[PDB]
Amino acid sequence: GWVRPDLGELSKVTKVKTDRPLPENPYHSRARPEPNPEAEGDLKPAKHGSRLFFWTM
Amino acid sequence: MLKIIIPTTMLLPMTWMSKHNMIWINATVHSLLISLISLSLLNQLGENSLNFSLTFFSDSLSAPLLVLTTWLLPLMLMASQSHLSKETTTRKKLYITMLILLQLFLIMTFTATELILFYILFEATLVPTLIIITRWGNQTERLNAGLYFLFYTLAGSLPLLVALVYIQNTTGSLNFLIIHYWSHPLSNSWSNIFMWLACIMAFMVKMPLYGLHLWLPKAHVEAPIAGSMVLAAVLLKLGGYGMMRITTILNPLTNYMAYPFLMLSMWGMIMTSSICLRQTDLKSLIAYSSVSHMALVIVAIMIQTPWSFMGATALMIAHGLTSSMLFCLANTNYERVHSRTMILARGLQTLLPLMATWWLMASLTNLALPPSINLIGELFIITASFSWSNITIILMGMNMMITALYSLYMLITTQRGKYTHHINNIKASFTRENALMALHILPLLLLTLNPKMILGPLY
Ligand SMILES: CCCCCCCCCCCCCCCCCC(=O)O[C@@H](COC(=O)CCCCCCCCCCCCCCC)COP(=O)(O)OC[C@H](O)CO
Numbered sequence: 001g002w003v004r005p006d007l008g009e010l011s012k013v014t015k016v017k018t019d020r021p022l023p024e025n026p027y028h029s030r031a032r033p034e035p036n037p038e039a040e041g042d043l044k045p046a047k048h049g050s051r052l053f054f055w056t057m
Numbered sequence: 058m059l060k061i062i063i064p065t066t067m068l069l070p071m072t073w074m075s076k077h078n079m080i081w082i083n084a085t086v087h088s089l090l091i092s093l094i095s096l097s098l099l100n101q102l103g104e105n106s107l108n109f110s111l112t113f114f115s116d117s118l119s120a121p122l123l124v125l126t127t128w129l130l131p132l133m134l135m136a137s138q139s140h141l142s143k144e145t146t147t148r149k150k151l152y153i154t155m156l157i158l159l160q161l162f163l164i165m166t167f168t169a170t171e172l173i174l175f176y177i178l179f180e181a182t183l184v185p186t187l188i189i190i191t192r193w194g195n196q197t198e199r200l201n202a203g204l205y206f207l208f209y210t211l212a213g214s215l216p217l218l219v220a221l222v223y224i225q226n227t228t229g230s231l232n233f234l235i236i237h238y239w240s241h242p243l244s245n246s247w248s249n250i251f252m253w254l255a256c257i258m259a260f261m262v263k264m265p266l267y268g269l270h271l272w273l274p275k276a277h278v279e280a281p282i283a284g285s286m287v288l289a290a291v292l293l294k295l296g297g298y299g300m301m302r303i304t305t306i307l308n309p310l311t312n313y314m315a316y317p318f319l320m321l322s323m324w325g326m327i328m329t330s331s332i333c334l335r336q337t338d339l340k341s342l343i344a345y346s347s348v349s350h351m352a353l354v355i356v357a358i359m360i361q362t363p364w365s366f367m368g369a370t371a372l373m374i375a376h377g378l379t380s381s382m383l384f385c386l387a388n389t390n391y392e393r394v395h396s397r398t399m400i401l402a403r404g405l406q407t408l409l410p411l412m413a414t415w416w417l418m419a420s421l422t423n424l425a426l427p428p429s430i431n432l433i434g435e436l437f438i439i440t441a442s443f444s445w446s447n448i449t450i451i452l453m454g455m456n457m458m459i460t461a462l463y464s465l466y467m468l469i470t471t472q473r474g475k476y477t478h479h480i481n482n483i484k485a486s487f488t489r490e491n492a493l494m495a496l497h498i499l500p501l502l503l504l505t506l507n508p509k510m511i512l513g514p515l516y
Binding site for chain 2: 054
């Protein structure tokens with residue numbers, strides 16, 4: 001009493017019901033380097049201008 | 058500060074936009090006016106320099122040189138409107154443009170508060186002078202002359218550029234006050250000598266010391282009259298100003314490394330003045346005399362003694378005014394005879410009696426005859442040098458003895474003696490030449506009453 005599967009039926013993505021837990025880190029990833037701290041605080045005018053040699057501004 | 062600068066640069070549009078023939082007039086008017094305003098800057102306080110802003114400041118050393126440069130500015134215009142009369146108006150305007158652009162830079166560098174700012178226009182004076190020597194110079198070897206003058210200073214200036222920026226990366230700012238207050242004892246590490254050499258050689262070159270001086274005879278002789286005065290009366294003196302300013306952070310390394318220059322300068326002045334004793338060219342003779350007087354200042358500045366700085370500033374100005382005058386003497390004689398050989402036109406006093414006088418105080422002033430400012434310079438330097446070492450007076454006094462012989466040597470060969478028979482184009486001296494000559498001598502004796510004005514910050 002079987003039935004011939006129709007076209008596309010075998011290619012259907014199916015939900016499989018399992019009991020095994022999902023792997024935590026399947027790639028066995030190590031700890032991640034901490035990103036460098038971001039910029040913060042309001043922009044303030046450059047102190048004493050360009051500060052390049054004799055240029056005052 | 059600004060009250061001198063904008064009047065100087067705003068003078069430039071005037072000459073360009075003035076009438077066809079009034080260029081000499083209006084330029085002379087306000088150049089003298091600028092001199093008056095500069096004289097208002099001559100005042101100084103006790104110890105703190107006259108500071109104006111981060112960009113400009115003046116002290117008891119800068120002020121006498123500032124008023125000298127502005128005072129000079131009318132004189133080239135007066136001295137040049139004879140060999141440039143037969144020139145297109147644009148070239149005359151361009152010639153005037155070069156002078157005031159040159160003079161503008163001089164006010165900038167002397168009043169500069171930052172060493173790099175002092176440095177940028179330190180060589181920027183070269184470009185106008187290079188044009189003056191090359192284009193309007195009246196000779197053939199002026200081309201090689203300009204090359205010698207240009208390359209010598211650059212060969213010395215570029216080490217200063219590397220040295221100066223090194224100070225900035227190591228000791229923060231290079232503001233003249235901030236260097237003086239935060240001065241540190243320069244070590245004896247073998248790098249610090251090359252540190253010392255770079256910070257000094259730049260001012261050495263454009264302050265002709267024996268060996269590094271061959272550009273000056275080629276600089277002065279082929280240069281036109283205006284070029285010769287500016288080059289000999291102020292240009293040889295940027296090097297002087299630098300040393301008084303830059304030797305703040307060269308101690309105690311200056312104490313030990315001074316020896317090769319001191320021997321070179323002290324011996325060089327005897328050699329150079331000896332050249333003056335047997336120079337065939339009048340302009341060259343005056344040029345070599347500048348080396349001798351300037352080499353005296355080399356010993357003066359490099360001893361690093363309160364008295365030595367004071368006599369330096371005395372010879373700083375007095376030689377410049379005198380050398381400009383003697384170049385005027387040679388120029389005022391040259392076009393009449395159209396030659397530079399001294400023996401070409403002998404016995405000029407019998408023909409031109411007033412020029413006999415003008416040549417006479419001119420020679421006496423260069424003689425360091427007391428109480429002329431030149432004597433105050435040399436005599437002060439001798440005492441400072443003598444305290445440094447007793448032997449140097451043998452070299453010191455010998456220079457004065459040689460300086461006597463060659464100074465009157467031009468007087469006897471040209472002014473006194475028998476007039477030359479063949480020449481017949483010697484006309485009575487134009488009162489322009491006469492007026493200019495008094496424009497030089499009169500402030501010199503006027504300065505004799507007040508040495509304290511030009512003694513300097515050490516005073
Ligand atoms: C026509 C030739 C030149 C004419 C004469 C000019 C003056 C002679 C000496 C020229 C010196 C130029 C280079 C100096 C730049 C500034 C020097 C300075 O600030 O001092 C440094 C001195 O250090 C140097 O090495 C400076 C250069 C020494 C000389 C060698 C190169 C210059 C000479 C050859 C090139 C120029 C000559 C012409 C070549 C065609 C300090 O650094 P340091 O070595 O103490 O640094 C910390 C640590 O020790 C390691 O760095």
